[PDB]
Amino acid sequence: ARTFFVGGNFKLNGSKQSIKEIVERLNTASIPENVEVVICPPATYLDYSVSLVKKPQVTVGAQNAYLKASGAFTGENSVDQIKDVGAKWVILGHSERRSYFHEDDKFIADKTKFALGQGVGVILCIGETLEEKKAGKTLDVVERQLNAVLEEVKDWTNVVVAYEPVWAIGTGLAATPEDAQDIHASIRKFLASKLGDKAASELRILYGGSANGSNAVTFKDKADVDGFLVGGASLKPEFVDIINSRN
Amino acid sequence: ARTFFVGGNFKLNGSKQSIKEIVERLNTASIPENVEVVICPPATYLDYSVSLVKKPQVTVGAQNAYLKASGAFTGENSVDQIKDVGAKWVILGHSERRSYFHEDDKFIADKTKFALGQGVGVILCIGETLEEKKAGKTLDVVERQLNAVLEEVKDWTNVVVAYEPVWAIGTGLAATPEDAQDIHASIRKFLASKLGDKAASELRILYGGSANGSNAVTFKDKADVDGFLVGGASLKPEFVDIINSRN
């Protein structure tokens, strides 16, 4: 049905030594063969990371890309390049990009369309702030964010959506399995109206925001929770626990 | 004396193969002793670049870094990682970051201070637009940009300043060696007052903005032009021509 999907977002963390260690832990670990795991290291380590991977279920993605393959854009990363080195994914629209780097919805829509055109999968990030939450605006907010992508992307076969409440990112204040499931269901319902049911049925909608080796297990029966996008826990042994949480 | 410094700004360009060819060429060609060459590839290729270089004159640098070494800054580059992988420089303040990515003088200052603090050299870009130039603000502008840095930074041992008129970047409209020579000396003056004589006298000030194999030579006898920061041409053979430009 929808394959369980776990993404590891290392953020700006790592060394060859630490990366080595993570990747090797993955190569060695016992994980169901019906899982899709993606680790996302700093661009500096995409190549290296791709080289250490000796597990079929493990694939590397980048943490961000520009909306052109090549050109006069000093300091950016290209989808063509992350792919050249072996990566298969790219996280677009992450919250950290959104607030700090002023990445607007349109911008992320242009980047998604692009990467997808170049044949890389996309982990598209969406989610509300404590303030949009409190104001009952969670769903408008996510529908705003997705609509901007939908205007551009017609084929979502290679998109994985990761709903991540802004207020749950790295705070340890995760959404409850219950709230997450309903939000996911609503998102999914929203999308079916736009992409058809076959497509929304096959789409993975991960939960992200303080997902750890402990609470992962409590989301195990939530039908519209298809996996996680893990920040802090991705760099800990406990990441393997996340992977097996439905095992 | 000041050692001729040539910087190669790949911008969003390269493949392992195209980078292999560039580096192998640097490796092959007759280049001066006492030249200082820094090739700056996309972050995706830093490590590989560094493993290809065989030439002691050639260093690898990155195109951008954030102002903190580690953290929840999805998609950014760390000075610690570029270093880990063996690059020795970072380009900070490039007009492309200044314009497309809304990077302001402060951010750039903060970035310059951190980078140095972690012991990576900085290639600090400064420059005026067509407007500012036409209006005779060029010194104004660059003194501005430089002071923002001066205020956080004090020891410029490891800084190289790249004066790059915005109107010359990738347009094919290079400054005249006269103008350039003029502008560098003023800037040098200015820094001597703030950084003292010795400092200002050992600090390389580069010219960038359509510096190519054809005109690199026309700057040969300009005392205050210590080298170049090359964009388009760094991808080309004529790059080694720029390095050998000082007869």
CATH for A149: 3.20.20.70
Q: Which two tokens stand for residue B189?
A: 């003056």
Greatest Cα pair distance, chain A, in angstroms, is: 48
Map residue A153 onto helix, strand or coil.
Answer: coil
Q: Which of A10, A12, A210 to mutate to test the interface with B (most CBs of B within 10 A)?
A: A12
Nearest to B99 by CA among B164, B188, B176, B14: B164
According to DSSP, the residues that pair with A245 across neighbouring strands are: none
The answer to whether the CB of B82 falls within 8 A of the CB of B65 is yes
Q: Hey, how many other C-beta atoms are within 10 angstroms of the C-beta on A182?
A: 15
Tell me the C-alpha distance between B146 and A194, whole Å: 52
What residues of chain A lie within 8 A of the CB of B170, using their CB? 72
Q: How far is CA B83 from the centre of its chain?
A: 17
Split into its structural domains, chain B has a count of 1
Q: Which of B73, B74, B95, B122 to mutate to test the interface with A (most CBs of A within 10 A)?
A: B74
Tokens 């000093």, residue located: A74
Interchain CB distance below 8 Å, B44 and A74: no
The DSSP element (H or E) to which A109 belongs, if any, is helix A105-117
Q: Give me the active site residues of B, please.
A: 94, 164
Establish if A112 touches chain B: CB-CB under 8 angstroms: no
Q: Which two tokens stand for residue A136?
A: 């009952």
Tell me the C-alpha distance between A66 and B78, whole Å: 18
Establish if A172 touches chain B: CB-CB under 8 angstroms: no
Instruction: Give every CB contact of residue A77 below 8 A, 6+ residues apart in sequence.
Output: A43, A62, A63, A64, A65, A66, B12, B42, B43, B44, B75
Instruction: Give every CB contact of residue A228 below 8 A, 6+ residues apart in sequence.
Output: A5, A6, A7, A206, A207, A208, A211, A216, A219, A242
Experimental resolution (Å): 1.9
How many Å is the Cα radius of gyration of chain B? 17
Establish if A91 touches chain B: CB-CB under 8 angstroms: yes
Instruction: Write the residue in A11, A16, A81 that is nearest to B74 by C-beta.
Output: A11
Q: How far is CA B67 from the centre of its chain?
A: 18
What residues of chain A lie within 8 A of the CB of B66, using their CB? 12
Q: How many degrees, rounded to 5, is the angle at CA A226 between CA A220 and CA A232?
A: 80
Tell me the C-alpha distance between A242 and A214, whole Å: 8
Instruction: Write the residue in B12, B80, B84 that is nearest to A66 by C-beta.
Output: B12
Between the two ends of chain A, the Cα-to-Cα distance in Å is 16
Name the residue range of residue B11's domain.
1-247
Question: In which region does residue A174 sit, left (phi positive, over 0), alpha (psi from -120 to 50) or beta (all else)?
Answer: beta
Map residue B28 onto helix, strand or coil.
Answer: helix
The answer to whether the CB of A5 falls within 8 A of the CB of A11 is no
CB environment B120-159: b (16+ within 10 A), e (fewer): bbbbbbbbbbeebbeeeebbebbbebbebbbeebeebeeb
